[PDB]
Amino acid sequence: LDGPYQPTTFTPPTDYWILINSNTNGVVYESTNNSDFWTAVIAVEPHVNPVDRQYNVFGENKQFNVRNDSDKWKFLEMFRGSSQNDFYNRRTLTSDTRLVGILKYGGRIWTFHGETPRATTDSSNTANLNGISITIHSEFYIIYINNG
């Protein structure tokens, strides 16, 4: 509906889906409150063998082992709950549409995971929702995931 907006960093308001039109094979967005919430979504092109790729995430070079044996894009959610904790692949969205969504609502971050056209929403808790800001690397909309 509203957009597209160009890649930027901002603090999302609550109750609005951010829909990111992923158009490359790297970091799609980085989201943190710098206390209890770090999420980076990495885009993996169809049909790649296991590779150890370097990403610049929150000003640190991180190596992630990624793979994709499918015809679809893989959007890996990498999560850590503190600056000291290791990132881990918390969720994966497997998508032909290349749309990634995030919502702030009810003290939670909501995203889509699983495989289009039956991707479902899931929640992450935070003690500081209001402090979560996001750097979006692709054009985005503010309000589909499964359908385009």
Ligand X SMILES: CC(=O)N[C@H]1[C@H](O[C@@H]2[C@@H](O)[C@H](O)O[C@H](CO)[C@@H]2O)O[C@H](CO)[C@@H](O[C@@H]2O[C@@H](C)[C@@H](O)[C@@H](O)[C@@H]2O)[C@@H]1O[C@@H]1O[C@H](CO)[C@H](O)[C@H](O)[C@H]1O[C@@H]1O[C@@H](C)[C@@H](O)[C@@H](O)[C@@H]1O
Does residue 75 contact residue 66 with C-beta atoms inside 8 Å?
Answer: no
Binding mask 115-134 for ligand X (x = CB under 6 A): x--x-x-x------------
**Residue whose token pair is 């190596």:** 63
- Please give the Cα distance from 90 to 2 (Å, whole number): 29
Could you say whether residue 114 binds ligand X (CB under 6 A)? yes
Of the residues 68, 92, 95, 126, which one makes contact with ligand X according to CB under 6 A: 92
**Residue 96 makes contact with ligand X by CB under 6 A:** no
Q: How many CB atoms lie within 10 A of CB 9?
A: 10
Minimum Å gap between C-beta 64 and ligand X is 15
Q: Count Cβ atoms below 10 Å from residue 28 Cβ, excluding itself.
A: 26
Rule CB under 6 A: say whether 94 interacts with ligand X.
yes
Q: Which is nearer to ligand X, 81 or 114 (CB)?
A: 114
Binding piece for ligand X, criterion CB under 6 A, among 9-17, 44-52, 113-121, 140-148: 113-121
Coarse DSSP helix, strand, coil percentages of the chain, rounded to the nearest 5 percent? 0, 60, 40
Which residues are near ligand X by CB under 6 A?
Answer: 90-92, 94, 113-115, 118, 120, 122
